[PDB]
Amino acid sequence: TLSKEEEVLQNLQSFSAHFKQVLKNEKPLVYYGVLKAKAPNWALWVYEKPLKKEIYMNDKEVVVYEPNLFQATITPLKDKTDFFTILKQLKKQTDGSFKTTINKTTYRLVFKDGKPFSLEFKDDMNNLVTITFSQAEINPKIPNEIFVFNPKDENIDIVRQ
């Protein structure tokens, strides 16, 4: 009664992948990085190119660290919308994609060769965000400390918005 993709989501406890992030508008400026996610609701997005940014996320908040600025911006989250939460919520659609809606934003996951392949949603400006995964790993061992925002030094301005 579970498809192969449905079993992956049921059994999933961690995930890592390289990603390409495209936002559709004037000219596609494409961001590249690495994603690590882990139960219960932890996620880390490391952008490597062309800008370096680290986005730590859990159930309660998101931390956006901009090393070029020596600044971290913290936003409390009212809805659980981290990557692992979304996956554990997806339901299979008639077209074979997977979807879920959280706070009026619909997220669409497509699989390929048995692994998460792409994630698509509108941002809060109604712009379409497409994230494509490569070198995807199902249930890798990801050490917990990777997820701890450790400045590490203390030049960092902490901005709350």
Curated annotation (Swiss-Prot):
GO terms for biological process: lipoprotein transport. HAMAP family: LolA (MF_00240). Belongs to the LolA family. The gene is lolA. Participates in the translocation of lipoproteins from the inner membrane to the outer membrane. Only forms a complex with a lipoprotein if the residue after the N-terminal Cys is not an aspartate (The Asp acts as a targeting signal to indicate that the lipoprotein should stay in the inner membrane). Keywords: Chaperone, Periplasm, Protein transport, Signal, Transport. This is Outer-membrane lipoprotein carrier protein. GO terms for cellular component: periplasmic space. Monomer. InterPro entries: LolA/LolB/LppX, OM_lipoprot_carrier_LolA-like, OM_lipoprot_carrier_LolA_Pbac.
